[PDB]
Design a protein around this ligand. Sequence first.
Ligand SMILES: O=P(O)(O)O[C@H]1[C@H](OP(=O)(O)O)[C@@H](OP(=O)(O)O)[C@H](OP(=O)(O)O)[C@@H](OP(=O)(O)O)[C@H]1OP(=O)(O)O
Ligand SMILES: Nc1ncnc2c1ncn2[C@@H]1O[C@H](COP(=O)(O)OP(=O)(O)O)[C@@H](O)[C@H]1O
Ligand SMILES: CC[NH2+]Cc1ccc(-c2ccccc2)c(Cl)c1
Length: 326
Amino acid sequence: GPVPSRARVYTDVNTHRPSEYWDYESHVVEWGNQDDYQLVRKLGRGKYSEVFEAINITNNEKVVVKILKPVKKKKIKREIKILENLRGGPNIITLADIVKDPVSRTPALVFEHVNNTDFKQLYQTLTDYDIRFYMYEILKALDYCHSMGIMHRDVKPHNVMIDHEHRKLRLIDWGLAEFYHPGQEYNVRVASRYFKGPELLVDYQMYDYSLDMWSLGCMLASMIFRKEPFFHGHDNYDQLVRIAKVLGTEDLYDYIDKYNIELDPRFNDILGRHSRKRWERFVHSENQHLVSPEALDFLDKLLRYDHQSRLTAREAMEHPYFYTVV
Ligand SMILES: O=P(O)(O)O[C@H]1[C@H](OP(=O)(O)O)[C@@H](OP(=O)(O)O)[C@H](OP(=O)(O)O)[C@@H](OP(=O)(O)O)[C@H]1OP(=O)(O)O
Ligand SMILES: Nc1ncnc2c1ncn2[C@@H]1O[C@H](COP(=O)(O)OP(=O)(O)O)[C@@H](O)[C@H]1O
Ligand SMILES: CC[NH2+]Cc1ccc(-c2ccccc2)c(Cl)c1
């Protein structure tokens, strides 16, 4: 069978902690009163919830109400527990209340409001400094949650709220997040296609925090090269082919050999043979002002097939790319 793996950092943080911390199924959830909140407008609507801008009438403060859709109760509890565990953490969205609609008993999470500056307007006005700055704010959020035994598992632009005017960043959507237990075999059907790490695509279940580091690399690549998404796959099998067209097929076979992984036969006719492309080949007139040797060196250290070979959030924070922010 496949070779076992464990995280290089924060490996045993949950083991040495009491069951109360990580046992979300046993955690007691206390539902507040929805009448303290007046719904203003729809903010978004994902595949798991409906999100509304609201006012807490008891202060006149702006909040965000995330109504939750038909899902496994286990998952709802897990999200609540992780949020409560991470509450107060740097650049972690703050869960302010847990409420249930008196009539239909629909669960809803109440968060601090973030004035999310337009994503289509941001992409065009961000400078080399802004990218380094916001990448560092995400790293503070990841180093923190990884240190608390949690992997986000859905790191992407849509899960990152930025109030550019106040230079404030929040990592949101903790619905797919999970407690890291060394040796545990996790579901690979997590994260969004474009940001899925190779481990998920080759069905390698014993993954860890490093999954978030791959997703972060995909975001950085898309930001400095102005190509969204960076790895544009049409499906989960095609997604790996897209990575292979960049990282090459030689290092891919080295990866699956190191962990004794068996490639699904769907890959037989689509993988092909690909040479490793130099990161510099992605530099163009439209993006050259966001690219630097340090950016390329940093990106190269995030986008590795081998999850164990990738920089940790702490190692990433120490990289020369962050000297101008740090
Ligand atoms: O959208 P897909 O079919 O998945 O493929 C995309 C798409 O090009 P095409 O759609 O025309 O093949 C992108 O274009 P947009 O749809 O985003 O306009 C393009 O990037 P650009 O946005 O710069 O055009 C990108 O890469 P490239 O243009 O280098 O082909 C390319 O990816 P694939 O080449 O992997 O299909
Ligand atoms: N704290 C928040 N501040 C501002 N907008 C938010 C906030 N939380 C969620 N949203 C908006 O709602 C969308 C969906 O929220 P999210 O937690 O990511 O739910 P889902 O898991 O269903 O995708 C976001 O992408 C964003 O547009
Ligand atoms: C709908 C919310 N999206 C907002 C958003 C915009 C830009 C980035 C970003 C910033 C710096 C580097 C790479 C990406 C992110 Cl993560 C999220």
